[PDB]
Amino acid sequence: MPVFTIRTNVCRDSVPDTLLSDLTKQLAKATGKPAEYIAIHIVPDQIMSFGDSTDPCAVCSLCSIGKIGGPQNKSYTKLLCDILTKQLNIPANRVYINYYDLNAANVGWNGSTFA
Amino acid sequence: MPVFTIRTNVCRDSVPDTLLSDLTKQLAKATGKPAEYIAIHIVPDQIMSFGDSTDPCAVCSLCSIGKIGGPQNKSYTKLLCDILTKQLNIPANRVYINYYDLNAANVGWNGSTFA
Amino acid sequence: MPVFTIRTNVCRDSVPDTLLSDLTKQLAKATGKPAEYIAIHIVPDQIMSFGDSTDPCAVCSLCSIGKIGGPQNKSYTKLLCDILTKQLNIPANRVYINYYDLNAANVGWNGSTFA
Known part of the structure; x- marks a missing residue:
């Protein structure tokens, strides 16, 4: 159960009003x-x-929580890098993406965790 | 020696001026x-x-740095989820909480680390 | 290939216009x-x-991705704590620094990862 965030210096106004649904769908x-x-x-x-x-x-x-690995992360990168330059006009070379594989017992949700 | 942060779309104005002392005390x-x-x-x-x-x-x-485990995280969640809906009006089901157990040697403070 | 971020309550206006190049050089x-x-x-x-x-x-x-360890983190802390009080006027005792050693396979960049 993933969370993806983008921290950029690009201004709020260049943020396609589609991105949210967009990154979700993808x-x-x-x-x-x-x-x-x-x-x-x-x-x-x-x-x-x-x-x-x-x-x-x-x-x-x-x-x-899972879905994180070797070939996966590369695939994700190319994906997220394509989306980021197209939508936010951010060159692929000036972008870092930290991938994290969370453990269910360490993810609180709706009152409890996924463990 | 914990740090707890809330990242929400709720507007600054709905932030009880108590939350800070509140989440600290709790x-x-x-x-x-x-x-x-x-x-x-x-x-x-x-x-x-x-x-x-x-x-x-x-x-x-x-x-x-510690105080992180199985039953603990659940306890924390219910706690933090109760506080978040009451104070910020954020439903429990639209909230994720990532729990992290830091290693003392990896936490700088006042010039050095906790190692 | 490091990333260093500062999250503070200090106001934008007290942010030396040098900090960025400054923390980069250091x-x-x-x-x-x-x-x-x-x-x-x-x-x-x-x-x-x-x-x-x-x-x-x-x-x-x-x-x-590396450059993270025992004595290293202490060294970094004293460094970053010196810079933070001098430039942002933030006392060393009211500052936490979380150090992280990333795995190359978990760091997307320019389309792929460092793996």
Whole structure:
């Protein structure tokens, strides 16, 4: 049950009003996890630099209980990198994505955990 | 020595001016860790969706050097979920909480680490 | 290939317009990692408390594929704590820094991962 967030210096105004449903629909397919169990967080107007340049960049993170591995993460990257340059106009080379495989017992939800 | 943050789309104005002291007092008891060593971070006005809905939701995280386990996390969840709906009006089902057990050697503080 | 972010309640206006290049130049030396592969994220105006006080504080995080260990983290802390009080006027005792050693296979970049 994944969460994907984008932290970028790009301004709020360049944020396609589609992104949210967009990243939800895509990650759902990609990870093969329920669209209802996916939460997306977009953070623009941020103060950040990459390689010492304040040009458009992003540091993202995908947390998922499973669906995280070697070939998977590459697949996700190409996917998320394609979406990020197209929608936010963020070059692929100025983007990091931290992938995380959470343990069910460490994910609280609706009052309890997934354990 | 825990840190608990709330990232929500709810607007800054619905943030009880008590929450900070509130979550501090509670987590302190819950985890049985010094109130002085707890830091709370609240992030409202955020761009996020859950299950493809932009309705009130939250993705939280509790980082603590210990005090993290099976039954503990459930206990924390019910606690944090009760507080979050009551104070921020966020339904329990549209809330994720990532629990993390940090290693003392990996937590810098006041110039050094807890190792 | 590190990322260092600062989340503080200090106001945007107290953020030296140097910090970005500053933390980049320093971490680069410190961790001995390419300045081009370092991304810095600064988050001010935030709602946070520490020890139940809303006075200037910060919760930072340094993610790096390696260059993370026992004596390293202490060294980094003293470094980052010196920089944070001098530049942002944040006392060393009201600052936490979470250090993370990422696995290359879990870091997407420019379309693929570092694996």
